[PDB]
Design an enzyme around this catalytic site. Structure first.
Site: not given
Length: 162
Positions: A103-105
């Site tokens: 996840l790219c958060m």
């Protein structure tokens, strides 16, 4: 692991199990192999107006699955380092999901992570951010393109340019 990590992880679980969001079944938590450091987290209620919600109904019809299964993995130095969070199934496009299911958060990077965050808050943010980023199910998608190794490789690639 460590006494610090474990102490905190037990406090997080306890807070989760008493929370309203958990009580009303938005998501579920279970330990894997009875390890405090590895959790199944299922997103069970996503925004009912989103196309993601619609896609999950189709998946339920197809595979009996109406949820997103996440994997949380914690390290010795938790809560100073964030959990590593990845999607197990189904395969998704958009939604800030990378190859391998990372996840790219910002909250999950070294820049954005704070020990001020409860794990409940992290789970709810992920739920909101998938919807905000227009996550869709990839129905033709190769099974087993998601695993720890490949998710780590994507996350490592992002740190090089972020």
């Amino acid at each position: 692991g460590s006494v610090q990590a474990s102490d905190r992880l037990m406090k997080e679980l306890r807070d989760i199990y008493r929370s309203q969001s958990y009580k009303t079944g938005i998501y579920s938590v279970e330990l894997i192999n009875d390890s405090l450091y590895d959790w199944h987290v299922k997103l069970q209620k996503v925004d009912p107006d989103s196309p993601l919600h619609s896609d999950l109904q189709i998946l339920k019809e197809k595979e009996g699955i109406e949820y997103i299964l996440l994997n949380f993995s914690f390290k010795d130095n938790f809560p100073f380092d964030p959990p590593f969070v990845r999607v197990v199934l189904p395969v998704l496009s958009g939604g800030y999901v990378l190859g391998g299911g990372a996840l790219c958060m910002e909250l999950l990077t070294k820049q954005g992570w704070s020990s001020a965050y409860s794990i409940e808050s992290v789970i709810m943010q992920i739920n909101a951010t998938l919807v905000k980023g227009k996550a869709r199910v990839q129905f033709g998608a190769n099974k087993n393109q998601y695993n720890l190794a490949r998710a780590q490789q994507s996350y490592n690639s992002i740190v090089q340019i972020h």
